[PDB]
Amino acid sequence: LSTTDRVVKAVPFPPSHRLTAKEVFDNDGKPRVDILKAHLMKEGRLEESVALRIITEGASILRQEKNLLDIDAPVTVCGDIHGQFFDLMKLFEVGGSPANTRYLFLGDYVDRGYFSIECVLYLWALKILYPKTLFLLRGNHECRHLTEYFTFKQECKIKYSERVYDACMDAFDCLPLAALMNQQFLCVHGGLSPEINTLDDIRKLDRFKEPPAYGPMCDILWSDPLEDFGNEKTQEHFTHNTVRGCSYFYSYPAVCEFLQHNNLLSILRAHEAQDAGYRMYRKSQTTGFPSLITIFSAPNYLDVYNNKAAVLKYENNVMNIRQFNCSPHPYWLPNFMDVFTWSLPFVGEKVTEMLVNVLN
Amino acid sequence: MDADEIKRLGKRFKKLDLDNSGSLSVEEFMSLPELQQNPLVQRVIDIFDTDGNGEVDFKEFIEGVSQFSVKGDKEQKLRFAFRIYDMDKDGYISNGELFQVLKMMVGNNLKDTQLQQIVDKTIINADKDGDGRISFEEFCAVVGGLDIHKKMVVDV
């Protein structure tokens, strides 16, 4: 075996060149998403200025949108992605090309998966290209507090720069919080809030900021249904959320009261992993329809959960759950460690052990 | 080395030289049980074998062992660790030899595809002058602050 040429030749060597603005934006200033997709699938990078242009042009579109989007059916609704870029590619195959498919994403694009910045760049480029047919909500991970604790900040500094991270953080502040879909569904990442009684209470929030540690914006991003949702002995609508350490659990009575007061059919949300990629919760007694639905679009989450992912395609008065399996992705050592940092401790250990035993 | 150290190394050399040829073969090293389980033994022997004839003579043996003296410097220990990876002894860690040496160490804890991917990414991120290989300087820029040289000391 050669000491210079590559051993495992079936693995393509990633490109070192960083795409330029002329390579990424066509003759009309539109992103060339097919170029971008092929390059990012090879772990290719962009020139810093081009990455910043995608992030800031995307932010500009988001910044002009309402806290609560109004989205007509038909639409494909997607839950958590968490940096699993190669599964995002499968997602678009299953749900349909954005060229002819309306999309709503419920947040959590980053952290846990090691291709978070590729997720952001590609989704932001699609938002630029499809400003009125592809929609992005904020999840609880689209903030400074979580991305500096999890790996997105480090990912940015390894692949790009802290300047690109900082741009993402300002972009994330522009993300809308909720969608009213087909005048039937309230769509959010987390769920309901003690301080949100009507849709107008969402319209009144100031969203252009880091999510606070408490309050309605926080709850929209962070809240969960009770563990015993629909089976309540818990008589309180809202209880402290001990899993999250902030915000609340909401109960089935709480949800059904909100739906009836606001003339809604269901709440669509994400935020909790599901073995099948989705969960349908207890029907409201007044509607006959699930009061709550969780959609989770990250298959084989963290490379260990072995779950399916799903999206929800809502079309022609059918709610079509489409499941999908995980896809191969390139390997990274934990925390983006290089192979010298990884192996040198063991090298020092074992060469010293040999010498000790040689000399006895 | 001290006088008493030079005397102890001669005695030990003779005990390892099973066939009394005046040089240590790979088989002779591998006769030690603790070395049969150590995946870097051939790499260390190859580094000691500065004249490339396949065996370690006494001069090679003393020079080799002196790299691990408490009197050695950081650069000297880090240079030895570099040479573990630098199979072909040109002064640069290249893709093929970096994979092969890591594969020696990890065995089947990684698949060949996963290992080749993380080797590629380290070559790309650590190569600063574009020649596609890792110089000793590029190597030290990455690991010099881990203080592994402190652990590479033996009492003679």
Binding site: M280, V318, M319, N320, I321, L333, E349 | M105, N109
Partner: peptide, 19 residues
């Protein structure tokens, strides 16, 4: 430690399982 290791009216609901 012999080998290096990796560190530590109403809509109908339908299902299309994974391909």
């Amino acid at each position: 430690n012999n080998y290096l290791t990796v560190p530590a009216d109403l809509p109908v609901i339908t299902i299309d399982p994974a391909s």
